[PDB]
Design a protein around this motif. Sequence first.
Motif, short mmCIF file in Angstrom:
data_model
loop_
_atom_site.label_atom_id
_atom_site.label_comp_id
_atom_site.label_asym_id
_atom_site.label_seq_id
_atom_site.Cartn_x
_atom_site.Cartn_y
_atom_site.Cartn_z
N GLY A 1 42.83 23.92 60.38
CA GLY A 1 42.00 23.83 61.56
C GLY A 1 42.69 23.08 62.68
O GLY A 1 43.82 22.59 62.56
N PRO A 2 41.99 22.97 63.82
CA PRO A 2 42.59 22.31 64.99
C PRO A 2 42.61 20.80 64.90
O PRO A 2 43.37 20.17 65.64
CB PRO A 2 41.72 22.79 66.15
CG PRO A 2 40.39 23.01 65.53
CD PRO A 2 40.65 23.52 64.14
N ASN B 1 46.42 22.26 63.77
CA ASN B 1 46.31 23.08 64.99
C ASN B 1 47.47 24.07 65.11
O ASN B 1 48.28 24.02 66.03
CB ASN B 1 46.18 22.21 66.25
CG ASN B 1 45.41 22.91 67.35
OD1 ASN B 1 44.89 24.00 67.17
ND2 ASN B 1 45.34 22.27 68.51
N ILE B 2 47.53 24.98 64.14
CA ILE B 2 48.57 26.00 64.08
C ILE B 2 47.92 27.37 64.12
O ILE B 2 46.74 27.54 63.79
CB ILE B 2 49.46 25.86 62.83
CG1 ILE B 2 48.60 25.87 61.56
CG2 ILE B 2 50.29 24.59 62.90
CD1 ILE B 2 49.41 25.98 60.28
#
Lengths: 38, 377, 175, 413, 167, 370, 283, 144
Positions: B81-82, B86-87
């Motif tokens: 997740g961000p 955050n990918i």
Amino acid sequence: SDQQKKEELLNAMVAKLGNREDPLPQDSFEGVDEDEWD
Amino acid sequence: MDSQGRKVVVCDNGTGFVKCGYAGSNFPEHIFPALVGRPIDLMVGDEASELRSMLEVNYPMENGIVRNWDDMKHLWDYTFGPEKLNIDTRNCKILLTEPPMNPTKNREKIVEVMFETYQFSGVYVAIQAVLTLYAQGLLTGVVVDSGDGVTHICPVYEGFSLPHLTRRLDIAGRDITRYLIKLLLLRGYAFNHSADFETVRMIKEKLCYVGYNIEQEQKLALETTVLVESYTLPDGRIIKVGGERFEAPEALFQPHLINVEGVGVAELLFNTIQAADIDTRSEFYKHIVLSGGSTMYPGLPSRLERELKQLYLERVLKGDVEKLSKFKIRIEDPPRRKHMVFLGGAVLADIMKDKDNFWMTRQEYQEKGVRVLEKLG
Amino acid sequence: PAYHSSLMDPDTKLIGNMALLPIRSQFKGPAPRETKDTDIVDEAIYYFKANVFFKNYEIKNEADRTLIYITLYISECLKKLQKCNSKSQGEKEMYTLGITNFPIPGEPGFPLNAIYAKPANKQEDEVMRAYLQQLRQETGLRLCEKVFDPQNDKPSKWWTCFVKRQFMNKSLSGP
Amino acid sequence: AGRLPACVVDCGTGYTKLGYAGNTEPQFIIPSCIAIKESAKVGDQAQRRVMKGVDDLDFFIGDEAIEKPTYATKWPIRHGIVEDWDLMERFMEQVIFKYLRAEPEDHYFLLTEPPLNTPENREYTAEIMFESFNVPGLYIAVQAVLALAASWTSRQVGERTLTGTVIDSGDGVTHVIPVAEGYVIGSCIKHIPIAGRDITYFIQQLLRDREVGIPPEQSLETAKAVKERYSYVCPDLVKEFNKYDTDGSKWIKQYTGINAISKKEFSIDVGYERFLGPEIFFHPEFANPDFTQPISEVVDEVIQNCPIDVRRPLYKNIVLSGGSTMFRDFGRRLQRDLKRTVDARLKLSEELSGGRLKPKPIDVQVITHHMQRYAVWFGGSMLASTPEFYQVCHTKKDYEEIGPSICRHNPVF
Amino acid sequence: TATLRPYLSAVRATLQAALCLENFSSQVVERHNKPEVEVRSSKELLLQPVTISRNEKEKVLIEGSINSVRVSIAVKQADEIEKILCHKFMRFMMMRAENFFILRRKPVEGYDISFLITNFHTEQMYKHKLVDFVIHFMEEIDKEISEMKLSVNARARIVAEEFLKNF
Amino acid sequence: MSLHQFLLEPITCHAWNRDRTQIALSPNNHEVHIYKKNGGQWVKAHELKEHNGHITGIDWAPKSDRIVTCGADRNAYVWSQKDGVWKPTLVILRINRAATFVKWSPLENKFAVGSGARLISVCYFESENDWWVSKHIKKPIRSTVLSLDWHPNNVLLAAGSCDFKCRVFSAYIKEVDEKPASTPWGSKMPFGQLMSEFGGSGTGGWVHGVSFSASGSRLAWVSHDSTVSVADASKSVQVSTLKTEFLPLLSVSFVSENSVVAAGHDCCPMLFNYDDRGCLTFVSKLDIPKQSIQRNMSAMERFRNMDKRATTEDRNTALETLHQNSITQVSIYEVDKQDCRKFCTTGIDGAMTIWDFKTLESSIQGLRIM
Amino acid sequence: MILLEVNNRIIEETLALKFENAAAGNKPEAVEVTFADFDGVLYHISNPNGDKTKVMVSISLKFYKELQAHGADELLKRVYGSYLVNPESGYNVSLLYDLENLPASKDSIVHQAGMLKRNCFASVFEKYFQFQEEGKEGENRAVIHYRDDETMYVESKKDRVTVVFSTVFKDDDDVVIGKVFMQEFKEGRRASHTAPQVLFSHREPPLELKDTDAAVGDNIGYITFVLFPRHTNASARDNTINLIHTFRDYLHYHIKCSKAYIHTRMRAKTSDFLKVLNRARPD
Amino acid sequence: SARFRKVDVGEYDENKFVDEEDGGDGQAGPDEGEVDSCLRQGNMTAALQAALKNPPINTKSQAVKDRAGSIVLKVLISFKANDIEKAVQSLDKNGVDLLMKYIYKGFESPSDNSSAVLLQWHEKALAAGGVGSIVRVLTARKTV
Ligand SMILES: Nc1ncnc2c1ncn2[C@@H]1O[C@H](COP(=O)(O)OP(=O)(O)OP(=O)(O)O)[C@@H](O)[C@H]1O
Ligand SMILES: Nc1ncnc2c1ncn2[C@@H]1O[C@H](COP(=O)(O)OP(=O)(O)OP(=O)(O)O)[C@@H](O)[C@H]1O
Ligand SMILES: [Mg+2]
Ligand SMILES: [Mg+2]
């Protein structure tokens, strides 16, 4: 051999002790009335 | 960092913790516990662990193999997740680890979940012993792993694991904790098996060790008061631990004390090494690497070297004393046994990042399906 | 645990955190008249012999503060009834005890300053002082017939054995 | 005279019970005090007298130690824990050779211990029994298992287990002890600091407040006799005060005592202290200003800290013991309060679940049996009479080669 | 009497030289601190054993190492009552060996009592106080045994006279 | 004679900084405490916790301000200061036994660790890949190395061990150092070359302390058989040995060209002289007994009190020396080995003592240090 | 205490409580008590066939056949009389008390009930004093096996009565302490001149017991008492019999009390050593 | 099972400490004739100074060390109590150390009243030589 001697001792305790049907020693004393114990 | 700009993410999934970082990093960026919480909506990761009393807990993975798949999916979308990584999942390369002696259906299911659901560009899975020997900088050796469930012995030759020589011994730290509970009950202290596991676990982590010669330690126990130490219970009482400190980890070498048939770890290691080819025996004896949580006792490699030398004296030379000086062994334990698997995965992701034959492509997965997994070897 | 009152009805008025409960009396005061048989004074006399042994009381309502005040005043009645020997100077003693003043809440002489809320303005002070004086005189006149024993015309030994006990280690008169 | 029975000795803070095995009642119950001569100078350990003659044999134990002129009375035990070993050894000398009249080289021995005991006290007791008197055998037992075994006489043959909760109350500290499968869970034993001495002191200060005519030297024995003869446990408080105020002819008793120095008689009236005595078990703030927790909450906190799979057998078997639990209607009040607390917790959980969980209602039983006053001695006496006891008990030979370490651990029944 | 003070002076002069200890880790097994007089693995870390004799019966044996020292004491025993009281007193002290910190549970063969002193004890306490405790112990034992023997005889005379009076 | 009592538990080792304002020491556990002088009192400034075992060696570099620590967990750390926070760096030693001693080089580009695995490790810094690498000297060492010292030309090294010998090795690394010059000790210097070996024949004592001189052509060492020895290289390498009549010594230091100061189990420092002819003599005790112990409790009266102790001998409740236990470390506090005026001693009793030469010249009659 | 008691304590307290309850006209209660005594003697107190108005005391001894040959039945019949009944099964001597026919004085009945064992042993001594009083000679010695390993020999002469005890010490230190105690017994006639003569022998029997098969061993000791006609007349024989049969238990009691005094004495020296060692710390 | 655990492989190690020996067995100790002549004519100090010559510190034979100890303890038990401190002060440091070694060897086998004489000699040698001689006794590899 703790366990085998202990379970034979426990079986001796189970087969040894009898039962009593006499009234308890607490019943000879005087106390509060019966019907409000609820 | 590659030419196409797709970043390489190393994610290690141990049983107690989940670590994640980038390729080439010398330290992990993010560490979480593996936990799924339900209130009595669904909090996964760090934030379930501080708020422990409200949430009923669930551990998804046991002994390195996953038991509940949707909980591991929620763990994966928590990590991807961000808030933490955050990918973009369509533009990343990912490396993963697997425990040894893994059944193939679990590996097929993990590869299917990575390639179909999240749509990753490049997925590789590797055995942890090869990552440990890459972290040490070696290529050939024998890895002895001892955790909480089982004990594994696995040899790695020329950067690949030999599948028909990996051996398993069913003795670990919980049996030593139960044996320490029985030995403490034999001295008169009152303990229970279910209510007093963690206290005896902390006593075992604090005080126990491995004796070199058994008769010397027993003579020191029955003649002197050197070995007596004191421990403070959480209630407030003070207990005294004496000669149980070397008697508790002796079940690894003599399995008949805990009513388990078989042989010890040194005889298992000798029969594992001696069953291999004759010309490669000298390379295996000079590279033995210890790992795991149960191998941190003091005095373990000296006892292991002594039992290996006695077995080699009895069963090979058959009584010849003069040839014993030519036999050379060396057991190496690391002083940096914190994040060796992540460092080996980061080194392997760093050096082998631009060559085509390492990564498994998504187009070959679309063409074939489950036939890409024969390209691991 | 402890015993609480059960006379709370939400049409009743409040003087601070008091409860303006009705009373049955011949003395003048600001309290309303009571049509029912029971009131707060009979419940205080009823619960005094069990409430005097306790040391931790938890407030659940507004009438319990009034019950605490009457329970504190009954020990000051029993201190004066120790020395007396006949009835009629018993009521002559209790009338002169009921006339004289006591520290109101908001004053430093009051023991339970933390729980009791201070009154705001002057007519609230006048209504509070008249209400406490009427409660004082009525519980004195009610205790005069309950303490004394008629066949010997002496104070009873069953009521005069409760002198040294204090409710929550407090005292209205103090040391 | 082929086989001789074993000797059972149970020591305590207030009383010591001693007799032979195979019987139902102990032969002697004595106070645990020793009167020694202290004619030397007070407070001087260097001037503590060398026994040139036989001057350490000039002492009295038991009821002869109470109020002897030119002698000093000592109580060696504080809370079930021995503090002076010399006085304990001199106590056991006159226990063995004067009252029991048993040659110690022919009889086996059974002794009891406090629930939380270090192994060093077991080593000291084994040293005193094996090195001075030369007994052929010794067994040190746990009191809770003996009480749980002695509670089997009111029970049918199919329901005799060794899992339960023991509430022990004497002259020291009230203990709540859980026992699971014959082994004591040592991390959950709880203490309540209320016993018979506090009840006697409370009744004594009530009689000092109300009545007149009691001599000042005989107040404590009068309070002890009033506690032992006229006492009961009431359901409610204000209804008893209404019963005593409305009809005083039935519920008010009279007690007659004899003065010791003048040989005269005095009479007092026993009123409110018949029921206000045992109510400090359920309201500890009446006497002790620190402890403000009733006994049922202590029992529930003992059971709720146990492991989950043995939580329901512990509610089904609660065994009373000790001499201070001999008041009438104790177990009914304890069972009613425990059932109220349990049912309040499950209706709160049923309200917060919203129909998701439906737990079964549990069964709570408090057991009153016949041998309640001497339960530990009765359990030891019925243990020692079997022929299987001699294979379990230690020998002097195992003390001779192995050493004192055999008595640190016993085979736990 | 005349031999007592030179014997104690020679024992005091020998124990001062043998109590120069130092912290040392084991060169055979990794992460271990062991007393070197008991394990006896390395022969270069041991000193020569010495003994001091007053007569044919009383003697003191001292053995040293780099981090430990062992002292064995033989006690004068005249006759049967003295040797059984000595055996009882040494067994009574060696049972409580966990409260002394410098006592062995079993003595070396041919002797009565043994002390084992490591470098942690001389880190925690002073050296000369330990030497003074050893000399004070050796002085107090014989006076204790003589007073116990005189107490036993003075008790037995009174018991015999008390029995024969009433007949 | 300035005494300061830091703490009750023993002090293992200590180190000073460049300006002699801060001190670093180990309180017999796995942590390192840094004390700073504020006003006229010492306060605790920093604590360093990274090891898992007993701390055995602390050293502080004077120029670059880096602290090296080694312990009994087979590990070594280099600590450097950033923004008031000390940060460590791990050093790979490749040993399987515990480490005993650590010393910096004079030019602060390498350091030497003596350990119990019958080897000496020399560690330097590789900056292309950025970590500390090590090399080993093995032969002919046969036991645990207890002491180390560096020659002032940054090449040679001196070691003492438990096989009753004192050796001089060459430690020259081509990647860091430059080409050295000739010395009277030898002319051929590869890595690990044995230059000279000293030791008594048949008389076995463990060597506790070695030291070089200021010029670098003389060596001194102490042993466990109460002997002090001085080796001179220029006069065809002669060894002079003096047998004392005291308890063994655990530390040694050259304070000038011709003066040796030593300390040990007798709790007091002592001074020895070495002339140009080759005779080692004993001069004096530097801890002269207090302020005479008040004429030694009146000289005629303590002679009569020794008659009183011949009647009733009783023991002294507190020793008359300024240390109540042994002394394990002697260090130079003022300027350097060329000019010494004050020196510092630490010990087992947990105290730090500063001594001055001029006050000891003024107090002790006929005393002259050069 | 120094001297041991003669009468029992359980029998006297139980019979005093039962007689005090039966004197006031209260309801009687059942009783069933079994216990022991010195030298392997069993006792039993029970009710015959469940009747609550009668109590019954019975004794059990191993060696009743030897005491019956010297006439112990007639002495018990002369002492007790109508209370003596037929014996219980598995027991030797049995008494019987009816609670409805008690006399006014009750101390003497309880006191004679407490001394049953002394009345069992007194018959041999009362027989053999009469041979010295009548001047007979040539009568055989009386051999009593009062324990498994211990033996009492009684012999009579013209002016002396000889009583020989054989005893076995179970431990090695008890032999030394008993040698000290019997040396003090042997020397102890220096104060009292009317005292009897006590002799002691270790590991060997005396000369007059050469004909019997007396044991020879390291633990076995022999004690000889010589009695004169100032002690064996018809006015001072009661305290003589009361003292001579409680000698071995007196000796072993004082040996165990001396060992307990020794174990008391060691603890102060151990505490002083611990205080001196704990003062040495720099706390 | 455990047949292989009985074999001790630690003492077959190559890197263990081996003691180094020097000198032959040709040292026969002190000669009996000159010390017997010095005892015969009564020169006690010359007997003590001739008895301490040629110590057998390198010979591994036991009988030479036993006869040397026999001659030295034969000389030492034939002194008066007032001639000890003159004979002690005539020696250098090595004579004091060798005398301390012979005294500490002489405590092994006591006979008659030799122990009081050895305690007097120990007191005078301790007063002359200090406590370092005992340390040099304790740390000697080759013993007399
Ligand atoms: N210092 C220590 N000494 C001894 N045992 C230790 C020590 N630290 C941890 N352990 C034990 O090691 C075990 C933990 O091993 P590890 O950290 O590898 O766990 P894991 O990842 O859950 O195991 P696995 O991967 O085998 O499932 C526990 O049994 C713990 O008691
Ligand atoms: N009805 C009663 N009958 C007998 N004793 C009673 C009664 N009520 C209260 N007691 C009290 O019981 C006490 C006896 O306690 P108990 O004999 O159990 O003591 P203890 O020696 O401490 O026992 P324990 O071995 O259980 O620790 C006496 O102090 C007595 O006052
Ligand atoms: Mg693991
Ligand atoms: Mg009690």
